[PDB]
């Protein structure tokens, strides 16, 4: 692994230092349907004219981003996404901008969000949850080795590809930092107590989030839930966690070490780092190399009928892409 990570780092640094820009333009794509909406725009299924390939186009409104002080995060998102390379990370195919918007064209993951499958099915069996978890563990090991913190782990950001494997999307809060950071960002149910407490935090928050993810996948509901975020935060900081009766002893033990408020005890943040997790009894049957190579038997393969199929995604209200005749926020997004 150390050998692999060292090379991955070199590759990453080259792109981080000299990012690619303007690798396509708007008229090269026919917009089909919205796959999801966000605070600064939306993600749409699109078809690239010349190739006929389908992609997911994330659209960001510049003025909006600037008004809401999210410039740095947006720049982080694209700079990082274009530089990473891993089997479980969605690939950024093209990127460009125009008078009004920023565009990030990713490979299209037709299988839909893990979220929809999870809610529909109710909960995943342990081996099924474990299959997904192993993938996130290897992804975090990779990202962390590059001084990157993901910051938004949740089923809604995890897509299932045609092989039944995970493709992580939404690097909106990804950031390259050595040491601690302070931004209050993420998704309520997945926030680690140190984030909520405004005390400064590090990569350890991704490991706590993994804990929440594993718990949600296996239980069918989050360990800390309520009607309002504020109520959720109180539960998270209290630390009290209760496990469903069906949880194995191993799962509960792993979870108690991930959903650990004490930073000196949280798995993934100790002397042995990721190895404390990889070597845990819950992952005993996990063949890490096989997982990385995508050779393990996927527990579930989404039904897909032809490219361009969006049957695995909910429907959203369509809207017209507006492109002003005047350039908006040009200086702010020069590097994009």
């Amino acid at each position: 692994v150390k050998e692999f990570l060292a090379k991955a780092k070199e590759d990453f640094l080259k792109k981080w230092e000299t990012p690619s820009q303007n690798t396509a333009q708007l008229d090269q794509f026919d917009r089909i349907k919205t796959l999801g909406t966000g605070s600064f725009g939306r993600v749409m299924l699109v078809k690239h004219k010349e190739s006929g390939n389908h992609y997911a186009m994330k659209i960001l409104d510049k003025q909006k981003v600037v008004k809401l002080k999210q410039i740095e995060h947006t720049l982080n998102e694209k700079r990082i996404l274009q530089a990473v390379n891993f089997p479980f990370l969605v690939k950024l195919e093209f990127s460009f901008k125009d008078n009004s918007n920023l565009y990030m064209v990713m490979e299209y993951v037709a299988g839909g969000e893990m979220f929809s499958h999870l809610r529909r099915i109710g909960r995943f069996s342990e081996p099924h949850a474990r299959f997904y978890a192993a993938q996130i563990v290897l992804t975090f090991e990779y990202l962390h080795s590059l001084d990157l913190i993901y910051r938004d782990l949740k089923p809604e950001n995890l897509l299932i590809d045609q092989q039944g494997y995970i493709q992580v999307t939404d690097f909106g809060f990804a950031k390259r930092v050595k040491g601690r950071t302070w931004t209050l960002c993420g998704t309520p149910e997945y926030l680690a107590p140190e984030i909520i407490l405004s005390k400064g935090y590090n990569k350890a928050v991704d490991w706590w989030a993994l804990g929440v993810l594993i718990y949600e996948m296996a239980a069918g509901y989050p360990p800390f839930f309520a009607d309002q975020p504020i109520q959720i935060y109180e539960k998270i900081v209290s630390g009290k966690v209760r496990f469903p009766s069906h949880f194995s002893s191993d799962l509960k033990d792993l979870l108690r070490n991930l959903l650990q408020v004490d930073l000196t005890k949280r798995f993934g943040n100790l002397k042995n780092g990721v190895n404390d997790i990889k070597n845990h009894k819950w992952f005993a049957t996990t063949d890490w190399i096989a997982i990385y190579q995508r050779k393990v038997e996927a527990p579930f393969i989404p039904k897909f009928k032809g490219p361009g199929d969006t049957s695995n995604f909910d429907d959203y209200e369509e809207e017209e892409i507006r492109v002003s005749i005047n350039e908006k926020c040009g200086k702010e997004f020069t590097e994009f």
């Binding site: 809060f173 209050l184 960002c185 993420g186 998704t187 975020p229």
Partner: peptide, 20 residues
């Protein structure tokens, strides 16, 4: 049950991220 309480709660749908 906990499941029933979650299912009747207002946060069972897609969750949006927060910032700042």
């Amino acid at each position: 049950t906990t499941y029933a309480d979650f299912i009747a709660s207002g946060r069972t749908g897609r969750r949006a991220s927060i910032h700042d």
